[PDB]
Design a protein around this nucleic acid. Structure first.
Lengths: 100, 128, 348, 195, 216
RNA sequence: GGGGGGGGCAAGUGUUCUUCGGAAUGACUGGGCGUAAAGGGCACGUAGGCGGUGAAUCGGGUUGAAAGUGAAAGUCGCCAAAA
RNA sequence: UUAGAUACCCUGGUAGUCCAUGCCGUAAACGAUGAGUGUUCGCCCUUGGUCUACGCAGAUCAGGGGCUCAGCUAACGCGUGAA
């Protein structure tokens, strides 16, 4: 029997006397989950194939590829204008972070 | 009886006691589909969706987790209708239960349905 | 045949007919009665459960079949349908063991009627509830006059008459749903509920509230529907309510009163009287007498069709088209004060 | 929901793949695995409830720790709270080691208390609650022997011989944040509970 | 009286905790003038605290079931060392059967040194109708195998000796059983235990749907 | 070995011979062959065994029903008389 | 060399080793593990194929080699099984 039901059958068939955690043990069962197979799926952000190649260049694009995929439905090779926008944000941010 | 049958049943059993919950069997068959269903509506499994009715072969069986040893016979042998009362005593728990599965001209039965319809056929499998 | 799933200690008699939208027939309800009368005296079983199919939980009561089986004139063909739905829901209430019900689809008409008089009720995002029998010509029937009569001030007289949608957030807010969950993670609690070898409700409630009531965040559900209603549906008679609502062909909130106006106008006039013959009476009686209460009404307003049109709703809504059929020869303007007791005669 | 936002901020659901279970992983990220934080929270629900119920009979608890990164977080508890013994809290500081929990009524008499502690207290802890990696194994073994339930943090790293004879697993997975306030939940519990 | 002496021993051990905690928390300073009391009161704590786990020996930690025994003579060869091993089985005719195994230096001493441990590590067997077992079953230990078939109410126990003296005082009356393979003793014990614990009664087989009728 | 005393059987006892069981000790029911006896040095190939699917047909095997026969005595159930 | 020495130790040394063709047909012919098919938690490697590459591997096949979850084993242990 299992650690939770062995003990119940035991005390019910009157083997040993009751433990002091039984009423609460049954009142808070263990957190079981649906029995699933192997295959831990490799889960990926949809914007993989460019951050690898862009952090090569120069985090914020690691999420800005989303603000690029949003127009990516008709994106020919807008990687160039994307890295341009990144140039823009880095230029202004580093102007500010050198003015500080 | 075939050996792809034995194969399907043993893959079921071994996946069960390994602990996965959904499996796929490539070489499929009608006598195997019937048997999956028989186990199902007797309780022992959860869904048995066969995919390709012809020419290819693929079943996906998703399972509950019951005992299921279910060896699938190889060497044929007769079974009359009035001989099961003693022959199904040679299952694992001789007395209590397990369903010796029988094949008939009137569809694949188990031994309850058999001894009711008073039909016979040939043994195919066990249940424990 | 109804799908009996027999887990360890949690049998579940899930009626179904995914061709009939999980509607209800006398055979289905009677078979469920058989199952429950068997299960009541059983040491093995612990509690009972109610589910549906992949699409929806409960929809309709084969009243299309009941018109096709009343156009001939056999009393019992209808009296038995109703007697064995009524005594069913009475049993539902009077059962010795816990009753869990699930809701995901469009529970409708008698939809919640089977479920609610039990112990617990789990909702979903796409649960959608209403009771348009006044829009068939009939009434909210079989204890709807209980689980809506008992409700915030003049809110049951909103629900039953007009017949608006009751979704998950709504039912957990207003306590129509005892608990809430999500779709793809409902069997997650189903197995949790099935495997438990426990008896008293006092602990199943905890094991389910594990994954039960955990969201009440509504900001536009009934935010001011309460006091929107406390102006009108707190009146006495249906026609007074609706006349004050015609006065409330208003200037500001009108985008509310107009649509409830139409939703009521989609219903038969004498039936728009029977809904108040239901609630403003059953707001203080129990469920077996509010049961027989609607029982006399159900047996009457079908055979003794004298002013309503119990069959034109059937013939249009489903058969012909959901165009308002002529259920209103004597509209609410001229509905005899004793039309409702001409229904409600055999009170004796 | 918002609590799930908070767990997700808690650098917790993600931890490297050293696993025997997969009932938990939302996926992987090649340097982490993401467990199902809702399952995390549900485990917390069950176990914390269990402790807050065991309260209603006031059964000894006797936490266990050996990795002294939580030392401060935990030490805010088990003294004047739960077990309530600060002196026993000092045993816990320097305990888990010797003849343990099954030969608890050992002599242990020899002190020669030179720069040693040598506590040796003795009473059946009706439940156990631990958190560390592996050195404490004796507590798990002996609890499973003598039928004592246990709450334990389990990472992907847990051999079956623990992962299956410990009830109530809190698959919390401490990771990049290292040790952060958790026990403050069980601090909420058992205090303003016992009425 | 049981709780009286329990909490009383607790009073002893609590004065122990008190004074020894005080002395410990005085680490700082001259040594002897606290260590004397240290040794005295700790020795006292030993004498008292071990009496709790002493208690199980004779009066409680001793139910009113019945027990039966086994024994052999192991060896070490430093010179010609000789000792004694012994086995015990407790049962109450309703079925709680347990056992235990321990060693000593002479027979009655080993019999004793188990006579107060058979009452721990208890397993509870489910004897179907107060006279026999629920069905037939095979069950094997390492290399001892076992077969259990019921019998209708009037045959009687058809078993050996080591297995008879277990199915007897478990509460069975009409079992027939066949143990085959090794004809050893301590494997037939624990074989019977690995067997009887294997039977799944209809209460169990209601692990899925179906009320399993009895045939009336 | 002798004296006494006691157990088991009983008009019968005990020894040997004879056959089965115990004997799973030829294992179909009911085994093994790494280190314990036992995997051939290796393959090829003959019979031989066994061995994919779905569609159709036939009805040899298969299987359902009836009669004949399966000597009587025997085993066995019951019943009755018989001691 | 020894009590003695057919020997081990030294120095000589033919048959034999080698090639040509034939004959035998055996070895601790030793993973002391017949042959084949399906199902099985991983990690570490690694021989040679394949796909995908954007700082670098990821994947996929055939094998050869360790270490292991489990499973089995009288015991050791294997886990390309001895499941």
């Amino acid at each position: 029997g299992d650690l939770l039901s062995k003990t119940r059958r035991l005390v019910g068939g009157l083997a040993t006397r009751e433990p002091v955690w039984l009423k609460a043990m049954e009142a808070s069962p263990p957190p079981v989950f649906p029995r699933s197979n192997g295959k831990i799926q490799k889960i990926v952000l949809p914007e993989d194939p460019y951050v690898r190649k862009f952090a090569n260049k120069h985090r914020v694009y690691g999420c800005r590829v989303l603000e690029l995929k949003e127009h990516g439905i008709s994106e020919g090779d807008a990687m160039s204008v994307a890295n341009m926008e990144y140039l823009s944000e880095r230029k202004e941010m580093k102007k500010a972070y050198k003015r500080l | 009886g075939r050996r792809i049958l034995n194969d399907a049943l043993r893959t079921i059993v071994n996946a069960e006691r390994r602990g996965k919950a959904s499996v796929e069997l490539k070489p499929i068959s009608t006598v195997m589909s019937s048997f999956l269903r028989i186990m199902k509506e007797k309780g022992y499994i959860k869904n048995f969706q066969v995919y390709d009715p012809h020419r290819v072969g693929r079943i996906t069986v998703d399972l509950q987790g019951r005992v299921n040893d279910c060896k699938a016979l190889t060497y044929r042998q007769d079974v009359r209708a009035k001989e099961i009362e003693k022959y199904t005593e040679r299952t694992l728990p001789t007395r209590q239960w397990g369903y010796v599965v029988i094949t008939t001209p009137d569809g694949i039965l188990d031994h309850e349905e058999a001894i009711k319809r008073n039909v016979g056929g040939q043994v195919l499998g066990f249940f424990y | 045949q109804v799908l009996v799933e027999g887990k360890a200690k949690s049998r579940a008699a899930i009626l179904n007919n995914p061709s009939s939208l999980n509607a209800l027939s006398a055979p289905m309800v009677g078979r469920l009665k058989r199952l429950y009368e068997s299960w009541e005296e059983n040491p093995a079983i612990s509690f009972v459960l109610m589910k549906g199919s992949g699409k929806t939980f409960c929809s309709g009561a084969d009243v299309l079949s009941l018109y096709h089986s009343i156009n001939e004139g056999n009393t019992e063909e209808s009296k038995l349908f109703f007697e064995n739905l009524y005594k069913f829901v009475y049993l539902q209430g009077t059962y010795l063991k816990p009753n869990i019900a699930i809701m995901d689809g469009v529970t409708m008409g008698c939809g919640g009627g089977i479920s609610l008089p039990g112990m617990f009720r789990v909702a979903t995002d796409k649960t959608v509830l209403a009771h348009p029998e006044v829009q068939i010509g009939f009434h909210p029937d079989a204890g709807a006059s209980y689980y809506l009569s008992r409700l915030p001030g003049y809110l049951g007289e909103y629900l039953a008459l007009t017949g608006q949608k009751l979704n998950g957030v709504e039912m957990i807010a207003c306590g129509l749903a005892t608990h809430y969950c999500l779709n793809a993670r409902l069997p997650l609690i189903e197995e949790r509920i099935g495997k438990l070898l426990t008896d008293d409700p006092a602990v199943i409630e905890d094991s389910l509230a594990q994954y039960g009531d955990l969201v009440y965040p509504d900001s536009s559900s009934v935010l001011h529907k309460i006091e929107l209603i406390d102006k009108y549906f707190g009146l006495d008679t249906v026609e007074e309510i609706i006349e004050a609502m015609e006065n409330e062909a208003a200037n500001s909130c009108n985008e509310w009163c107009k649509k409830t106006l139409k939703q009521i106008k989609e219903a038969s006039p004498l039936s728009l009287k029977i809904t108040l013959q239901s609630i403003r009476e059953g707001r203080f009686q129990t469920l077996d007498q509010c049961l027989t209460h609607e029982y006399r009404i159900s047996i009457c307003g079908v055979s003794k069709v004298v002013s309503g049109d119990f069959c034109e709703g059937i013939r249009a809504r489903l058969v012909d088209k959901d165009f308002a059929p002529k259920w209103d020869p004597p509209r609410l303007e001229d509905v005899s004060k004793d039309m409702v007791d001409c229904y409600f005669t055999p009170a004796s | 929901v918002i609590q799930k936002l908070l767990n997700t901020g808690a650098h917790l659901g993600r931890r490297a793949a050293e696993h025997h279970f997969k009932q938990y992983a939302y996926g992987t990220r090649n340097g982490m695995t993401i467990i199902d934080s809702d399952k995390t929270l549900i485990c917390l629900r069950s176990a914390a409830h269990f402790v807050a119920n065991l309260a209603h009979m006031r059964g000894n608890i006797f936490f266990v720790n050996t990795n002294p990164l939580f030392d401060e977080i935990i030490e805010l508890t088990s003294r004047r709270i739960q077990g309530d013994s600060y002196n026993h809290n000092r045993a816990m500081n320097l305990w888990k080691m010797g003849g343990f929990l099954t030969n608890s009524y050992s002599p242990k008499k020899f002190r020669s208390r030179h720069k040693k502690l040598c506590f040796g207290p003795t009473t059946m802890p009706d439940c156990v609650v631990v958190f560390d990696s592996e050195r404490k194994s004796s507590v798990i073994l002996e609890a499973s022997k003598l039928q004592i339930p246990v709450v334990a943090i389990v990472d992907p790293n847990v051999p079956l011989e623990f992962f299956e004879k410990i009830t109530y697993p809190v698959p919390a997975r401490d990771s990049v944040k290292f040790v952060y306030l958790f026990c403050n939940v069980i601090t909420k519990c058992f205090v303003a509970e016992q009425m | 009286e049981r709780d009286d002496i329990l909490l009383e021993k607790l009073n002893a051990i609590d004065k122990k905790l008190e004074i020894k905690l005080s002395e410990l928390d005085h680490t700082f300073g001259k040594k002897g003038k606290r260590l004397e009391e240290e040794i005295r009161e700790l020795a006292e704590d030993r004498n008292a605290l071990t009496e709790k786990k002493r208690q199980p020996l004779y009066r409680k930690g001793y139910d009113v079931h019945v027990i039966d025994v086994k024994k052999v003579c192991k060896v070490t060869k430093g010179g010609r060392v000789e000792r004694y091993t012994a086995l015990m089985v407790c049962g109450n005719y309703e079925g709680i059967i347990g056992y235990a195994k321990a060693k000593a230096e002479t027979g009655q001493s080993a019999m004793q040194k188990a006579y107060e441990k058979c009452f721990q590590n208890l397993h509870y067997v489910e004897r179907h109708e107060e006279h026999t077992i629920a069905h037939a079953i095979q069950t094997s230990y390492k290399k001892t195998k076992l077969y259990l078939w019921p019998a209708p109410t009037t045959t009687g126990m058809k078993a050996g000796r080591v297995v008879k003296t277990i199915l007897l005082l478990a509460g069975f009356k009409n079992i027939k059983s066949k143990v085959i393979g090794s004809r050893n003793s301590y494997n037939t014990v624990k074989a019977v235990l690995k067997a009887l614990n294997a039977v799944e009664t209809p209460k169990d087989v209601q692990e899925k749907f179906g009320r399993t009728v009895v045939e009336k």
